[PDB]
Design a protein around this ligand. Structure first.
Ligand SMILES: COc1ccc(Br)cc1/C=C1\SC(=O)N(Cc2ccc(C)cc2)C1=O
Lengths: 8, 265
């Protein structure tokens, strides 16, 4: 979940 | 405390989501000093509408109507995921949870919340789009060629029954938070501290509803049933998307949305 992790 | 938490959730909800339900209902009931939204019901009105938004926003774009609308949908969904993420991080306790769990909660929460907030922009006849400056009719959406003609329908059906409960933004702020903090999401590592946050959110929600919807005792109970209903709407939305994904060779799914859909249901 690359993008989600970055958002978080 | 509980009243303080409800207030804090309302304030960040207002900061995270530009187009509020209050604002949406004023547009849909003409109770606004602004210009009525441009209505979209066919090929030519869609093209006319696009002319107008060429002067408000802005690589690849299909000349097929259903695919182009679905592409526009994807970008709005991506923008909703971001908003929902900033909202979640405002919920006291959330950012202190294990990161892998935070990601899981959003992964499973995000669509449930999207259909919740979409309800605010809908009535039985259609849905507000582009920040409230357009309106797409339900019937026009039902007419789209398969499998896109049935994409919005269950979302309208949900919203018609949900909007009957007359929640306002302050109710919705807490309702959303309860959904995000669900301890029964698959693959959660530490269920306990999530349930501990949901417990207080549930209490704030119960109080908020008693105070502001005094005539509807048991609104809390009815709300709780919706949260579970949403789970099956998403499940069935996800099945629709795997169909589109496989058989619509033209379009490409957006990477963030793929992330969320992957290994989901
Ligand atoms: C006009 O809308 C459409 C017509 C036909 C087709 Br096929 C797909 C779409 C659009 C959708 S469905 C969805 O989940 N979202 C994202 C969203 C997230 C949050 C808020 C508040 C509003 C919208 C859309 O944009």
């Amino acid at each position: 979940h690359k993008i989600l992790h970055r958002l978080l | 405390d509980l009243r303080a938490l409800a207030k804090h959730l309302y304030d960040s909800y207002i900061k995270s989501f530009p187009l509020t339900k209050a604002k949406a209902r004023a547009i849909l009931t003409g109770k606004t000093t602004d210009k009525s939204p441009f209505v979209i019901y066919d090929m030519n009105s869609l093209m006319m509408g696009e002319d107008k938004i060429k002067f408000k926003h802005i690589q690849e774009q299909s000349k097929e109507v259903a695919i182009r609308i679905f592409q526009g949908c994807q970008f709005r969904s991506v923008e909703a995921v971001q908003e929902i993420t900033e909202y979640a991080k405002s919920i006291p306790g959330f950012v202190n949870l294990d990161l892998n769990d935070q990601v899981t909660l959003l992964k499973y929460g995000v669509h449930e919340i999207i259909y919740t907030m979409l309800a605010s922009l809908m009535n039985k006849d259609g849905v507000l789009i582009s920040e409230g400056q357009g309106f797409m009719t339900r019937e026009f959406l039902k007419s789209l060629r398969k499998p896109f003609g049935d994409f919005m329908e269950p979302k309208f059906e949900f919203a018609v029954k949900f909007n009957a409960l007359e929640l306002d933004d302050s109710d919705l702020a807490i309702f959303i938070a309860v959904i995000i903090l669900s301890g029964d999401r698959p693959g959660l590592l530490n269920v306990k501290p999530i349930e501990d946050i949901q417990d207080n959110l549930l209490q704030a929600l119960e109080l908020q509803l008693k105070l502001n919807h005094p005539e509807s005792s048991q609104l809390f109970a009815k709300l709780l049933q919706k949260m579970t209903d949403l789970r099956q709407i998403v499940t069935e939305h996800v099945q629709l998307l795997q169909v589109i994904k496989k058989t619509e060779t033209d379009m490409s799914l957006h990477p963030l949305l793929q992330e969320i859909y992957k290994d989901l249901y």
